[PDB]
């Protein structure tokens, strides 16, 4: 009974999205086409005749990327319609993906969230995928997050934004659609989790010895901590966390819902079999200030919830001594309201591989989703880029062309300033 | 009819799929008297010469 | 004769109620099928204590297993020992209350609440008394405090006069995970104090040092946890079960515990516990056995006794033994160990012999004590609940489906005073 | 040696009786081609109460089907047990009546119960007592409810003291086919008050219900909707068939239902039902099967007693039975719930145990029961009823086939005296 | 018997046929010779030892289609003299095919309504296929429905029209003639069925994703739904809805008889496989408000009385659940004098597929003949079609010159004027 919709948005949400749907698919056995040669009904249904669907919805303004996916080797596991796409792109601009051309994609993308929600008894999360630093993954993102509450009621709407890296951004309207964004990210949104592209850079190099890693190495990191973080929905275990436990032990009050996520059994193929990688060993490696797929180091801030998710052959006995290990640790510093910060989670099956790709075979695992009044300097980084710009109005004739209250960029910018006003008034 | 004609026990009495495969259970260390099992044992000391 | 209705909540009531009905149907000589498979009338005779009969034979549990979330009572149905259960002696919930008191309490549970004393009352008048009802449940959860003391409420109010036996499982500070542990078990300690009559303190926790120091586990799983409590939840309902030459009900237990009306939370430890390769070197007289059940090391609970007193303590042995032998060893504890034992009270302890041990065992010893250390935690759980909650944490959670924040305030009143309760007697 | 007339109209009567007289057949060893197979005396002696004897050898069944339109009897004769039927009372119509009480009363069924009753008639005389007439027939339809209401008519004015049960179906408030059913039902029940003693009022959402909470049935269907039904009047005529030790037949249960005439619209129901697991599981003592006839579970009429006062009751049980539990039973449920019974009738219960028990089952027990809280079922149909008649929807294809707006005001008049005189009896 | 005869007047009426007969004669697996190799008696008669001659007039005022039908592959199908072939069109003039040119042709044709009723033993009803939007469809239209009601005015009429198109319309006097046919329409016709030109169009898009479909693929899925409607005449089914089932729960008053259709799921092959297609999930397509075959938005109308025609592998619970599921949302509104009002039928058998078709092996299948307040609006456009051109008289000169008077007009505008005001007192 228990399910959830996946929503990938833009162009990095439909790559991230391809990623995580063909690991879970070669994790629960479904072919390319949809047979296997029911431990699967949260990702996906049944028609019938041993055929699987993908319980997605992707979208986007340019059509390139996602005829990308329609042509290539998953085109008949997916429904053709799923892959939804319009004619031409927003550009970069959040107003163009807001207020004009992604208004008539928006209700052919509910009609099949719709019918993909009403097919299926119990649901649990939407999950949804963005971009946020863009035109479509940030002006649509934010429309839809919107009409996603409106029409769903309560129904925890998951985030994984792909926010953009403090020192290098590959754009420079990067400083306004983001903060454009935090009037999505911020009301809407319940499980806003932070991923930035430098942090899992930092992460492929040191760990995976790889110089030089492409889009598709920085998706395979993400989908196995999704699939983590899923795997008590799907798996059996000694500690199931589903996603009712996961906003009442990670989450203290309704504007702070920022989360960093680190999975670290990250590790090569040539270098797994020269360490054990035990229980203890796999969360010291968990909590050190650079496996953090945000460039935030936590040491600068307090933590005041965790949520680790050991998976694979971990005994109890071994997560409740590891958590003491790092209660013990004065590097890390839990907030005075916190006796306890570490909500635990056990799952039996151990992660899995896809053949050819930049990970190794492990035993043991451990997605490490926190929250902490660190996060703070990540948005006051782009405080500074928004106002070296926004100071003699850069940019911005270009997104009141096509509609854009001129002010919204104001209201955006003290809906930053609320929550950095928040995260220092929670660590006093 | 699915029912038993007399009896009023249906009788194709389905088999609805485990939802998960509900495994790696339990087995516990101790055996039926609150003791330890005789699982192979290590030696964890020094080379004994 | 005496009937008891075992309800299991939450995750780890129904995974601790599982052993439970693992090792009393060992004791009976029950398959995991449901036949008996000896000969004995003395195995059999006191079977409706625990067990129903259903034409056939099929000796089915009285059992009332009950949850907010589709994927623990599954995990019983298909290990073994797990088929003994009827299909609707399981009260199914989807969603779930994830780790909310109030997802328990006021909404998501009071749905399906009816549908629980339904299978509770057809499984309480189905008989000609009833001595009460087991509830083994879960304070650090959601769904285990949440209808779990809820449920205590409610079939009080329809028989106040049953014995209310509770086994909970406190959460100790220390090693747990969940964060919202404080507010679970504040609220639920409130209601389980005029609702309960023997609540058990059995914490994890502590079991992890009798499984280390004690047993001496590699690798203790939770499996083993919960043996050890099914064990202590078989020797403490003994006499309603097999004969003796001292009998000793639950209603026994309650009255030559509890001095004044509230009163009633006890600490359990269970001992024929020997080490690894020990079996063949420990003894099993009275005097190992009464000098380990008073080891600070044999608690469920570890909230240590040296630090505090002895109310009133109670030692049900079980097995073939003297009474003179018992009765020595009941008063060497007082007359040398004196200052851990309260003074306004005298003769603190009694003793029931059951004359059938536990299966292999020779001789075991179950010691349920009244102790005023139990405020050990009720500070621990306390001070970690105020901690949280006076600069308002984890609240919107429990607040926007119904409760406001007096019942929190309150909730910590009676936590309180109740710690002052304990204090007095010190 | 008394005999039943069974009429089965309407589509919905025609594949519930075709279902009761395979529960009958099987009953007592009638082979398809009508032949006994075992050598039970006990089984065979009171053949002549629902078959008949033919100088081929083979026990033709008292019954007559009865359809406008001819595919339902092809199906009936084409399936297992159709072979049995005699061609002869197979009155078959080649119009339709298509969803219509006026053309089933007054347009083309008036020209067919002219030889319809002349089958009646060539059953009936044959000899020296009829006991009554079992006629089972939909209320929602125009085949069922219209026609319907001719035949009740005219054989209450051919024969005036011979009983006439009624398992008739009423519409369904939920979800229902046919939208003229509340004009169906309205006009049928005014003469289903007057010429009937005895209605077993059945609806469809409690045998949905049945069949998805005692049951667990992921997958029902109309024909094993029916097999309950056939159950229920396998048990109610069990005594007309089989010895007993307390004989209670159709009069009987007329006499000791019903206070005054008008009052006469009972609630069927039939319980042991098992699940799947819940075979092995569940006991076969007499209180038992008394506590699944006194549940709004299993009930077929989500009409719910509770909502009510139970007038009178009786319980048709079967089996190999001890004679004081089968009274108890209905003292006891009298006295811990005294509120749910009427306080002008002490002892508002009959037992009647008759020996020969359903077939692999040990017991029975069919509850026909008179209450109150039918009040529910006329209530909801006079307001689906009052909602189209006071802007006339639909009317004009019942004054078409010729009728006045009159007949639907007396025809509501009567049934909105009728949750009267349950109003001031509560 | 169960029987019933099957008009067709009009260049959409025969083409109509053309359809409905190739599929009909698929499923009672009669040849195109008639030889097949009691199912059949609805559509087809016993003549010869194996002849299945099919029970229809098809009529029309051109040689051009009767014609090249009896050149055509199903030539010694048909009874030759039932293709009726007229010899001058009515050339899109209501006064043509109604007063001068059709005071023939109807004399002959109703001598084979004679001998096609006096064949058969129990004769039900009429299915008349005709167009409105010109000549012929409505002139003949006209004059069979007035002459048929006066020697068979006892029986059943199943008109399904083809009303002319909103938008698209492929002739100019379309709206004349079309006024002038509400006057036989409203009172000779038992049932008028609302078929439209868009709505098999935009279903097309959406549904079976044809760019560029014909009309023959038009007369397929309307001949898939006439064979849901008289699906439990020639065969089984647990709730039978004959001819008069489907007129005594759906027509509340004698003037409202104008139902619009509904079939589920339109679908190819694309997407058959890619759904678990089932009782809930079809009848919530078919309450889709672009699913009607009208251009009608039943969202600014509201229901009176629904009919569905459930057929396949469908048990009776599943239509019991996805009506309720429908009865509870609320953009579906029904009216207050209709606490009831979902009059559900089921066949056992399948619907059938054309070889080299547009449709896929679907198991089950939904046909919806609702009856709504929306189908006002769609005589109400007619009448803002009529007022423009007779605002000074434009195209007169045939009408009036070819034996009507001029009056004729206003009296059927006035006629058309009283049905929507008949539609707005139904449901104050
Ligand atoms: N994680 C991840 N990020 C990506 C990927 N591709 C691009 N990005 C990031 O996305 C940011 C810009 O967003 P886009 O890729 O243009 O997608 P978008 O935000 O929806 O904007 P559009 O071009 O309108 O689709 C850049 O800063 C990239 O760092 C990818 O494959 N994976
Ligand atoms: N659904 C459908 N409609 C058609 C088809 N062919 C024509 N029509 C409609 O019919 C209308 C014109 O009338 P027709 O049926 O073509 O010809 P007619 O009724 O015989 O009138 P005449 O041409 O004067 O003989 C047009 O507006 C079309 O919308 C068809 O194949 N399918
Ligand atoms: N004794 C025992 N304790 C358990 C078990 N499972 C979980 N726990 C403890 O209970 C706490 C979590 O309780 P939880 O399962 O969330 O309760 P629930 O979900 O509300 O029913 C953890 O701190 C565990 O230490 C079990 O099977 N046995
Ligand atoms: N229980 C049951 N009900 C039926 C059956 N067939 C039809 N019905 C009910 O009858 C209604 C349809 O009207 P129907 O009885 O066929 O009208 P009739 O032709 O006049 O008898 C539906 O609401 C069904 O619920 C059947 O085989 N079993
Ligand atoms: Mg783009
Ligand atoms: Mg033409």
Known sequence: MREVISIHVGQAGIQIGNACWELFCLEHGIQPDGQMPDAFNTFFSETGAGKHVPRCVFLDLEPTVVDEVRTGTYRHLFHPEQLISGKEDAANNFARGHYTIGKEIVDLSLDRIRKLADN????????????????????????????????????????????????????????????????SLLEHTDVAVMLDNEAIYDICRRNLDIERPTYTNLNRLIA??????????????????????????????????????????????????HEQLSVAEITNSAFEPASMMAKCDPRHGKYMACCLMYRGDVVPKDVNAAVATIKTKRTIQFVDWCPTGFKCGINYQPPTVVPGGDLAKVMRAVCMISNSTAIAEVFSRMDHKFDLMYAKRAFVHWYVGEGMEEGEFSEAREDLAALEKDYEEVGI | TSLHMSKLVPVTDLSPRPSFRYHADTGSLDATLLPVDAVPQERIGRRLI | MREIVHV??????????????????????????????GDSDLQLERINVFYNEATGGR?????????????????????????????????????????????????????????????????????????????????????????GTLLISKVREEYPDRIMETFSVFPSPKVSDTVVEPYNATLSVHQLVENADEVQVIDNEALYDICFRTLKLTTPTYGDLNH?????????????????????????????????????????GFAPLTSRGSQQYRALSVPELTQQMFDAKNMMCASDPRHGRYLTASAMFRGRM?????????????????????????????????????????????????????????????????????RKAFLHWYTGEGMDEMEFTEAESNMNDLVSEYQQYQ
């Open chain 1, 120 to 183: 299926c008894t119990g649901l649990q999360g939407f999950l949804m995928f963005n971009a946020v630093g863009g035109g479509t993954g940030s002006g649509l993102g934010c429309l839809l997050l919107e009409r996603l509450s409106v029409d769903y009621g309560k129904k925890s709407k998951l985030n994984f934004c792909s926010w953009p890296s403090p020192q290098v951004s590959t754009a420079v309207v990067e400083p306004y659609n983001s903060v454009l964004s935090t009037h």
């Open chain 1, 224 to 273: 196995q901590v999704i699939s983590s973080l899923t795997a008590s929905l799907r798996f059996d275990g000694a500690l199931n966390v589903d996603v009712t436990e996961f906003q009442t032990n990670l989450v203290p009050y309704p504007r702070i819902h920022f989360m960093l996520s680190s999975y670290a059994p990250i590790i090569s193929a040539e270098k797994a079999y």
């Open chain 3, 8 to 37: 299991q909540g939450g995750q780890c009531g129904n995974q601790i109620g599982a052993k439970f009905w693992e090792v009393i149907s060992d004791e009976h000589g029950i398959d995991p099928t449901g036949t008996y498979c």
């Open chain 3, 59 to 147: 000796f089915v549990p009285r059992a009332i297993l009950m949850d907010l979330e589709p994927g623990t009572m599954d995990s019983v149905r298909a290990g073994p020992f797990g088929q003994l259960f009827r299909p609707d002696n399981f009260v199914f919930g989807q969603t779930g209350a994830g780790n909310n008191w109030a997802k328990g309490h006021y909404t998501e549970g009071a749905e399906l609440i009816d549908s629980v004393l339904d299978v509770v009352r057809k499984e309480a008048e189905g008989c000609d008394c009833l001595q009460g009802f087991q509830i083994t449940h879960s304070l650090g959860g959601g769904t285990g405090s949440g209808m």
């Open chain 3, 228 to 268: 050890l409590v099914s064990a202590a939840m078989s020797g403490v309902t003994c006499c309603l079960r097999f004969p003796g030459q001292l009998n000793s009900d639950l209603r026994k237990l309650a009255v030559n515990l509890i001095p004044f009306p509230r009163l009633h939370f006890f600490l359990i």
């Open chain 3, 322 to 390: 003297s009474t003179k032998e018992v009765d020595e060893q009941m008063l060497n504890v007082q007359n040398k160990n004196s200052s851990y034992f309260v003074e306004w009270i005298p003769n603190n302890m009694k003793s029931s012999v059951c004359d059938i041990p536990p299966k292999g065992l020779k001789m075991s010893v179950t010691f349920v004590g009244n102790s005023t250390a139990i405020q050990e935690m009720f500070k621990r759980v306390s001070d970690q609940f105020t901690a949280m909650f006076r």
